[PDB]
Amino acid sequence: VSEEEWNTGETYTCVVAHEALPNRVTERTVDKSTGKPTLYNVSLVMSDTAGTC
Amino acid sequence: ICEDDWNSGERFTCTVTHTDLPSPLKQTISRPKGLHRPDVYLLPPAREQLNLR
Ligand SMILES: *[C@@H]1O[C@H](CO)[C@@H](O)[C@H](O)[C@H]1NC(C)=O
Ligand SMILES: *[C@@H]1O[C@H](CO)[C@@H](O)[C@H](O)[C@H]1NC(C)=O
């Protein structure tokens, strides 16, 4: 695909139809943000740390 | 009247002479003789108490 399409972040999904799979079909996807991405932008937030119960 | 006399045990005498009653009535009251430390504990509100905001 054109690098512009990849730079857009459009997800591409590949399917494999084969006997051994449970329901005979499996899929995986990749985009600009998950294929060996340069940057991991995380905003981890925790609230009510105590939270007794 | 002084607080000490009540603690000292003096029976303060109150006389009641009612119009219908011919004989005066005598009432004498003092502190009954007969002390342990009340160590106070103040429990802060629980989080669940504070959970309602
Ligand atoms: C890095 O993280 C901060 C806060 O989590 C965010 O404001 C900033 O935009 C992030 N930078 C990049 C390049 O993702
Ligand atoms: C990175 O994460 C921050 C915080 O969630 C967000 O404001 C920012 O837009 C994100 N940037 C990218 C490029 O994902």
Q: How far is the CA of A52 from the centre of ligand 1 (A)?
A: 32
CB A38 near ligand 1, within 6 Å: no
d(CA B9, CA B29): 9
> Which residues 14-53 on chain A approach chain B with CB closer than 8 angstroms?
50, 52
Residue B26's DSSP bridge partners are B15
| Interface size, chain A vs chain B, as Cβ–Cβ contacts under 8 Å | 3
DSSP state letter for A21: S
Residue B12's DSSP bridge partners are B29
Query: Do B10 and B28 meet the contact criterion of CB atoms below 8 Å apart?
Result: no
Residues near B25 by beta carbon (within 8 Å), at least 6 away in sequence: B15, B16, B17, B18
Query: Do B26 and B18 meet the contact criterion of CB atoms below 8 Å apart?
Result: no
Quoted resolution (Å):
3.6
d(CA B40, CA A6): 70
CB A2 near ligand 1, within 6 Å: no
**Which of left, alpha, beta for B17 (phi over 0: left; psi -120 to 50: alpha)?**
beta
Residue of A20, A17, A13 whose CA lies nearest to A35? A13
**Method of determination used here:** cryo-EM
Q: Is the dihedral of CA B29, B32, B35, B41 positive or negative?
A: negative
How much helix, strand and coil, in percent to the nearest 5, is found in chain B? Answer: 20, 20, 60
